[PDB]
């Protein structure tokens, strides 16, 4: 639950939006600094995207994303991704999916979805991923393995 998850979501989404030429307000070692966690996630996300970006092509069209159906589509995708388990790679996929959904939404003039997606991501992290994260060494461990 800590505020770390929301911080990671905002940093990651802001970063992915910057790669598309967009600036977002961002509103609405057993111990390591969050700056290193953010960096590790940005790097993993980039490597993940370079290797599999075709999987995120036109998600807005595929999922028929609209403001009124966005939440449901997002939740269904993430719930199925984690249906049979959690691991760091799937968590990177989760961040990547959220980032792509954000960028592609702005691309279709549905910018209002950015802050909403950020909130849904934070909430999913804190309510459904945090228990596993903490039991598996926390973000400190993610960095040890992906850093």
């Amino acid at each position: 639950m800590s505020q770390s998850n929301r911080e990671l979501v905002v940093d990651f989404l802001s970063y992915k939006l910057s790669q598309k030429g967009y600036s977002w307000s961002q509103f609405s070692r057993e111990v390591i600094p969050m700056a290193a966690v953010k960096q590790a996630l940005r790097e993993a996300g980039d490597e993940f995207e370079l290797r599999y970006r075709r999987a995120f092509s036109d998600l807005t069209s595929q999922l028929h994303i609209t403001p009124g159906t966005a939440y449901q589509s997002f939740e269904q995708v993430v719930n199925e991704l984690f249906r049979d388990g959690v691991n760091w790679g799937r968590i990177v996929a989760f961040f990547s999916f959220g980032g792509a959904l954000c960028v592609e939404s702005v691309d279709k003039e549905m910018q209002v979805l950015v802050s909403r997606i950020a909130s849904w991501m934070a909430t999913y992290l804190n309510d459904h991923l945090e228990p596993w994260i903490q039991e598996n060494g926390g973000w400190d461990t993610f960095v040890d393995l992906y850093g």
Binding site: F48, L59, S73, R90, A93
Partner: protein, 33 residues
Amino acid sequence: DLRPEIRIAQELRRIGDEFNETYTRRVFANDYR
């Protein structure tokens, strides 16, 4: 014949697991010390 949400989610799962295996393999391959 899968709905979009499920088709995408399972593709993310597969590439997410593959990605995970890649880094897990790197740790094991280089931890002599």
